[PDB]
Design a protein around this ligand. Structure first.
Ligand code: GDP
Ligand code: MG
Length: 379
């Protein structure tokens, strides 16, 4: 009755207006099992019909069986099948080596608005490119560069985490070998300071905006894959050198040691908090660097509101799950001040005056809960 599958959370509509399916986003990210888990947000983005869903379906095979030597698979390819973002409804909980259980969210990003949105949300952004990295391909990164400068004016903390140029159908395998090492060699050459003055500046600045930039060169997958849209054939019908490098690529993106937890201004993000980033970014969607930065600070403060409120809520439920009215008030005022202190201790963006508004929202939401608890205790 219940089965994982792709869920449309962002849709472009026919009037060219973007809409966020908050109900669907909440249903997937606010489940009891994942809401408080730190999240790795994985996105595959790029031009239409360049093999993104095909890649993601192999990413699914690995995620569902990370510990299997045969995870890759005559087994047909299933999973992800215009403009928008689809997310996989199974938020994978993966054991990290440090003892954390992290949430892993996969997003298929199929427009510059959708591309900017997925990059702001992601902590691993796979930029899927066909055959080569073109100047237009780098020009798309320029707004992220300019947002990064404004964000870093007063801190050394970078706004973005991992970016991967995944070059499909690679053409030059002698000088730049298939895989990550040839890709790094190639990317260094392509990024070497130029071209149009705007593209010189993207090259100068891009490494300052991203914690990790890398590049993987993938072979052509063979005629059968290249020619049939719904390629329902054997793994034996896929080029063997493609499969060899695919088996390296996917754990290189997604192994437990590889998963990069989303973080902003030093704060690890939870699935609960990540919803606040979707909601703040959808409102500004191209926007200005200042509008992008203000949306980031707003989500950053609201993620702290959500964390402090949930803390007060679960500790109060543990208390009302009959107490004297003044013992219920005293415990309320104590737990409320603890959540207030929790919120004040978070390193939040925007400045004290900016954050005062969100502290007052926190206090109001906490008082809303308290009145519910009194009614539950009067009963
Ligand atoms: N040439 C080429 N085609 C591919 C590759 N990977 C998948 N395809 C084929 O590209 C077509 C479109 O793939 P799809 O995953 O739907 O592209 P998407 O729109 O980016 O999600 C299908 O026929 C795939 O079988 C690749 O590495 N190179
Ligand atoms: Mg797609």
């Amino acid at each position: 009755v219940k089965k994982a599958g792709p869920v449309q959370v962002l849709i472009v509509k026919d009037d060219h207006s973007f809409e966020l399916d908050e109900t669907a986003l909440n249903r997937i990210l606010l489940s009891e099992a994942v809401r408080d888990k730190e999240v790795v947000a994985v996105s595959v983005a790029g031009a239409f019909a360049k093999g993104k869903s095909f890649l993601m379906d192999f990413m699914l095979r690995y995620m569902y069986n990370q510990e299997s030597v045969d995870w890759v698979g005559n087994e047909p390819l299933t999973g992800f099948s215009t403009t928008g973002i689809q997310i996989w409804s199974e938020i994978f909980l993966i054991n990290k080596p440090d003892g954390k259980k992290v949430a892993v969210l996969l997003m298929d990003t199929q427009s510059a608005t959708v591309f900017a949105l997925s990059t702001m949300i992601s902590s691993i952004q796979v930029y899927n490119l066909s055959q080569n990295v073109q100047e237009d391909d780098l020009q798309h990164l320029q707004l992220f560069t300019e947002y990064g400068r404004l964000a870093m004016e007063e801190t050394f903390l970078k706004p973005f985490q991992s970016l991967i140029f995944l070059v499909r159908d690679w053409s030059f395998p002698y000088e730049f070998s298939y895989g990550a090492d040839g890709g790094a060699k190639f990317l260094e050459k392509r990024l070497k300071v130029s071209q149009h003055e705007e593209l010189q500046n993207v090259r100068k600045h891009i490494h300052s905006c991203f914690t990790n930039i890398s590049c993987f060169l993938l072979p052509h997958p063979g005629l059968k894959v290249a020619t049939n849209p719904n390629f329902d054939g054997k793994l034996k019908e896929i080029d063997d050198e493609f499969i060899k490098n695919l088996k390296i690529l996917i754990p290189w993106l997604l192994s437990p040691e590889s998963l990069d937890i989303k973080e902003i201004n030093g704060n690890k993000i939870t699935c609960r908090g990540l919803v606040e980033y979707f909601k703040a970014y959808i409102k500004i969607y191209l926007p200005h660097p200042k509008s992008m930065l203000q949306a980031t600070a707003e989500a950053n403060n609201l993620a702290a509101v959500a964390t402090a409120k949930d803390t007060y809520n679960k500790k109060m439920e543990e208390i009302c799950g009959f107490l004297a009215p003044n013992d219920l008030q005293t415990k309320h005022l104590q737990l409320k001040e603890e959540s207030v202190k929790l919120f004040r201790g978070v390193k939040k963006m925007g400045g004290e005056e900016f954050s005062r508004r969100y502290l007052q929202q926190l206090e109001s939401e906490i008082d809303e809960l308290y009145i519910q608890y009194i009614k539950h205790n009067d009963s």
